Design a protein around this ligand. Sequence first.
Ligand SMILES: [Cl-]
Ligand SMILES: [Zn+2]
Ligand SMILES: [Zn+2]
Ligand SMILES: [Zn+2]
Ligand SMILES: [Zn+2]
Ligand SMILES: [Zn+2]
Lengths: 396, 397, 396, 396, 133, 49
Amino acid sequence: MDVLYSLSKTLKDARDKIVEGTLYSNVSDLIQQFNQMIITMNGNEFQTGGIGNLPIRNWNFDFGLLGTTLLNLDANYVETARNTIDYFVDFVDNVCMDEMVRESQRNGIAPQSDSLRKLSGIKFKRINFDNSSEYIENWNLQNRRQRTGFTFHKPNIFPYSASFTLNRSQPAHDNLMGTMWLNAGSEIQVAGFDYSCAINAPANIQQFEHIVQLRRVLTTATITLLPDAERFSFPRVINSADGATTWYFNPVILRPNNVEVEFLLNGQIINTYQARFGTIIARNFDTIRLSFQLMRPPNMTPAVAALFPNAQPFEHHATVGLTLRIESAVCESVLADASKTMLANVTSVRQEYAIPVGPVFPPGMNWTDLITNYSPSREDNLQRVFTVASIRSMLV
Amino acid sequence: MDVLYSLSKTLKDARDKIVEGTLYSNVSDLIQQFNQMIITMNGNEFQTGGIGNLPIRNWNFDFGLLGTTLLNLDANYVETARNTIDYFVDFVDNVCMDEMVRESQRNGIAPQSDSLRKLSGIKFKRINFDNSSEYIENWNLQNRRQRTGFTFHKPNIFPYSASFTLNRSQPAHDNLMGTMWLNAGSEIQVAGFDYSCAINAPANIQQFEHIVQLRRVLTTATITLLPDAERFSFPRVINSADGATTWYFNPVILRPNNVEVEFLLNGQIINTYQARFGTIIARNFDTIRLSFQLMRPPNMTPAVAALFPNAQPFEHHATVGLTLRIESAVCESVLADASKTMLANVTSVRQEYAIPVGPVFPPGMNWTDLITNYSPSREDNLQRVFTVASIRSMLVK
Amino acid sequence: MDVLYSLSKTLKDARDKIVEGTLYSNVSDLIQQFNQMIITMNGNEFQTGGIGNLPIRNWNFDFGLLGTTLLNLDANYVETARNTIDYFVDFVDNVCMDEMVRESQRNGIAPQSDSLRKLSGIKFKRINFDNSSEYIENWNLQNRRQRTGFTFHKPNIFPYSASFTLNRSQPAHDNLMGTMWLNAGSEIQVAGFDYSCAINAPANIQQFEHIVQLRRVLTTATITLLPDAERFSFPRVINSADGATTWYFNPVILRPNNVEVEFLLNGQIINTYQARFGTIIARNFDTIRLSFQLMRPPNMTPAVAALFPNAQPFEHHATVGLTLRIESAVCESVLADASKTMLANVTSVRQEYAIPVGPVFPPGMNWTDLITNYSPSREDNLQRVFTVASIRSMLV
Amino acid sequence: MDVLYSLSKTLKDARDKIVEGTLYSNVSDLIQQFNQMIITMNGNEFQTGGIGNLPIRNWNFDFGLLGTTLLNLDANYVETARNTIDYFVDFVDNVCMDEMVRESQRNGIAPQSDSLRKLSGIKFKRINFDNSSEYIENWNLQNRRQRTGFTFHKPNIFPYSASFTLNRSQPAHDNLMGTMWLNAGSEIQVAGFDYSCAINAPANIQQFEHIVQLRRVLTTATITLLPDAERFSFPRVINSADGATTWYFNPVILRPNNVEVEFLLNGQIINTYQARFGTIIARNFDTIRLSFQLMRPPNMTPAVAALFPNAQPFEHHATVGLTLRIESAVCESVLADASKTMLANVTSVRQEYAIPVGPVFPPGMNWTDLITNYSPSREDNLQRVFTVASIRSMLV
Amino acid sequence: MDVLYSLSKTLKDARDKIVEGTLYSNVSDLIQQFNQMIITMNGNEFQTGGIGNLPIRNWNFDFGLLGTTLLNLDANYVETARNTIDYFVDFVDNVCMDEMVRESQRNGIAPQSDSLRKLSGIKFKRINFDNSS
Amino acid sequence: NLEELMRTGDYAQITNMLLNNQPVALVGALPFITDSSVISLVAKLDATV
Ligand SMILES: [Cl-]
Ligand SMILES: [Zn+2]
Ligand SMILES: [Zn+2]
Ligand SMILES: [Zn+2]
Ligand SMILES: [Zn+2]
Ligand SMILES: [Zn+2]
């Protein structure tokens, strides 16, 4: 993985720095690394596999070295370099694609393609140089048993789930108390609804609680907490738990009461925010607990008092909502996010070449199923393919 | 860690092998290792213990080398070596204790005490020699990220949980169908009860299922499965789920029917055992699914028929049990088990010096809390402290 | 076997002792042994697998010798050694796995795999060195016809059997006299029941006897005796002997009377324990004879006298229990036990590669069938596979 | 003892390492130690036996040294070594047996057999080399008056005692309040019973206490505490304290209330756990105090309410049980446990040769008597014989 | 114990035999034994412990040898010997008291106090002489 | 590697391989004899060096 990344970085630096008219001193070390790569790769035969519709490809290396004796690079130098760079880039891209479409259950972090296993031999360790990208840096740190983290903007940590819980219900669905929620990507929208507006509740308060258990620990997370859930703020016709019938939801939005957002790690409260909205920081957590209350307003103007009668029928249903958006976070493990293209690249390569479903990932690299069952084997394979995808992104 | 282990190993070998009258050829390499240790440690200052009631100890090393001109070891040689060994063993004990009482949320696998941090320098790496203990071997494999393995006799994998589930119930609690289980340590006792004895069941079969999720994957596990659960086979008065009232459980034990033990990894069937009792092997699994049926006996003697009427009241309740004991297993992570004393040693040191509750471990080293929420950071810290405890047990114990 | 064990132990010592910074004097002898192994193995071709789903693997040895350092080993030395050690460990693990999945009715003690058969040639005897483990020591002793000894914590010596015997019975199963027992693993739990409570028995004594025939002789055995059998102390509905009907058991537990444990060897009484509970020692035996009695209490309080009428119906049935637990023992043969993993390792290897059932062991390596019919050929094959499993555990 | 252990260790290493084909580099130091042992033992006459049926045996040592000029060991060398090894192993086994069957009151730590007393001479200290086993290590620590430590899996620290105490009793034994317990090995089951279900108790709570005194201090002990005593949860007829009559017990189990286990050292509370079940750690203690409560359920279903009437007769008797199992511990003294075999070895040797009862140990080496009255003299003799047994187990 | 007894015996014999005017032939062997004791004890630090209310006491030994070359012992000789003997007797009494107040369940025949354990080393065996009581 | 063999002085592996006819490649700057004789090839003199 370090050798593949080093090939990719050498080729990227060659593309960026070997340009006409540039001082050789601007590229001297790069040319030394490029010639080292050529020498190490010369005389070796490689095969990128026939998995799926990806064609079997054979690669040979009998390239000469680049010149080192000009003061400024000229057109001949750039053309001669480009001829070798194209072949090397094609080989690296094919090796990355071959590695991206393979997976293993026993050892998913180890190389899967024959090309990358060959490149892991000692004879290629000479190609290795600067490992500065975030993914390769994390890979090397983790091989060292060192604490390392990936930084995500809008991490995709929540499997998609639009669901509800009815703590009070009946076959006609006209006096309902419960919670509605959407956990999607980096976003949680939750809403507790009471059809009676806590008319017959102790102290005229109805308590709602929503626990979201993250599949991986998040650290130094910036979160936006807003006091309303616009997703559950308009009339809806909603299936029942068994789908036998459909019920009616007609929210009237009240301010949530006694809002407590707890970020917990191993069941212990790490961060607690009471009646705080805006930007909050969750330093280290694996669980989110949102407690809120629907408080019947003690005083109501006649228009308000009309909405909430003493008994049924309840035509206006009192709802209190919370919205929790994870803008940024850090994770030990790899995750899809709104900014990085690793998941998209891997899925695209797997779709283009009609890669059959393997024993590790779900069909189509579907992220909801993947993150729902984020097993250690899935984590290993997913980090491997994401690192290979980042390596491929440097050139493709 | 490797340097601390090597110090402890050198000291234990010196205590065992530097004995009066022994041939110098029996200890030549050991004497060279001991003198290498002395040379490396000489001129270095160490400080151990500023946490809880653990005293601040300052350690200075200015020792002479053991001689090499003898052909047999005599009393004076052994006494001088013993003096040096006693000082070194005291130092190693204190360093181990200082490391065991500390924890980090970030790099729990890394050294936490300043003495071990100092021992992590290059100059001390010369002390490193044979790393043959199971814990240090696993430590070195884990550092390179090779497949680790810890063998546990009666692994403490199940957090304590005595609870029940009622599938059929009502406020009088006179016609109940459900399961009650104890998952404790290496043992699962489960029992499905039907008060009606499946009189109105679909073909007089009542199916019971119990799923136990292990917090870590176990491999090469020897498991005893016995048909009956003696823990849920006598009259009991049991609190209701809400604790509002109490109900009565008067079991009569019938053999379980169509017993199926399923050992699954990542929700995939690895091992399946049907109607098999005694010793079985679960080669690689993280979930146990025990499914068993209460089958109403078609033919009953007059007493048996008197036990189970056609309708209520049901005075005798039909119960089918199962006992599962993990005798031995292998886990890639450290665990408490019956045979070892690592958890006991760490807890004893932490309690002896009133170590305040840290950000990593539960409030007192409670194993149920730890195994219930066995997080990667907790795993790193636990492995570190357990390896230090095993190092200390070579000398202090 | 001794050569395979020596290879495995050389590799284990190389992994443990060849560590960065160690004095070369700490490894000199180990380095000499390792280089001798390299010399003897180089130029030899080995093949493993070809049975079940165990893959065919080809092994070639073309390694150079480990060098020398003046004072202390460095990182370069450790990596160079570790490459060779990793290859050799892979080879040894594969050879052990190939040997564990094979069996022979004839010469079950002899090597069955081609790799181990080749390793038994004279040229490889050079590799042989310290045979200090318990299993290899017993292997050599058995080769020399010396007395072998395996120490087992909680030996798995009793095949699972939950059975009962009715000495007095009739189709209504309301006045029953007999015994019910569980012989499982290292545990015997027996209980003698009389429904009449020995009202008509001579001297008001009912004599119960249980005999367990161990399939191998156990020596130096620590055994716990407890008066009661908790497994047969609660009411239960029990199938008939032919399964035609079910009968009812409603135990009331009385102290077993005139308890006598006899540990016998070849029909001769070796150890006798009378009314002794707690820890006892059986020095050498192959048969256990537990004789106990239900003695009707001559004096009864009214509550006690109520349970035991002069005649039928008998609603409370008198039961006297007995629990025997072999905590540790020594056997001349190999057995599964609670502390080791040999049986688990062999079964796991056979199941992982879907090894077809052979003519020696029962399907799935089930221990109840294996110990029920523990033939000398089964003993030889099981000792071979257990020794190979112990050799493999040194490395894997 | 150290010389006898060194003889045994040299012989064991000779058996393990002097094998055909091994490099002389692997055994050079061992061969030197073996020749030193021959030189030291030559010209010395020993006599073992003469106690019980152990036969009198005379031992003469006149042996040649082993060669030193080989490069690899061959068959001739191994047989020449094996003859001497056989004689020496027989001598060591007989010396160990002669020592195991003897005891003294004043100085039981010192050697008792004339052979071992002769081996304690200064001239034999040349034989002494690596003392690495746990028992010899503790022997040397004891001889140096250092702190000793023995690890025990399931230490046999509790003498067998199945007893009960009735705090409320009548001649008819129909309204009984008390507690019954079994202490056995590493296990303590206790059960407090109230026949009236604490109806007349002050707060409808009955307090039960159980104090168990350990005959030796246990440190670093891991214990499992469970909330039910299955041993006292079934109906049984129990003898009266005087044996004059028998009473009836018909348990109905309620969960124990305010469970409090205290581990005390010299009357000082070292560890305390309240309402804690599963694995607990007792770091240093000599006494266990289990205090629990039977709390009458304030709310009862009609069946539960039927179980417990206002007044007599009481047919269902409320019971609360505790189970306490010591799985592992450390003790400064030797104890029989489930994993070791020293007690079994000593008892077997004493039984096989019909050793008359001595003035130190109880007849038959019975462990309950030994641990009930574990005096310092008994501890000395037991440590001596256990160390000798461990030495013997190296060879036999 | 034999070394402690020999110290006490040497001191008692010195107190009884080193008297003014006595012939040196009456004490020659005694003087040799006394000087052997002084040589063996010189340069050694001892501590009698603080068990109970027994005070912690420290003992240092740097003494000159008892002289030879007198036909009859004089007052100067007896005075010097008495100073040394007084210090040694105080040390021996304190060691005996420290040993008398200690006990062990096992190995209770062995010395318990640190001073007597130190005295049980080989280097003090030279002090040992007639064990007649 | 012939340089490493020269520097160490340990000829055990090379000797064992030459005695047992184990195929090998000796690597290092070497002088060679150019033999144009077919009879030398038939005589197999290249294997005698
Ligand atoms: Cl156990
Ligand atoms: Zn609904
Ligand atoms: Zn309920
Ligand atoms: Zn029948
Ligand atoms: Zn055990
Ligand atoms: Zn009574």
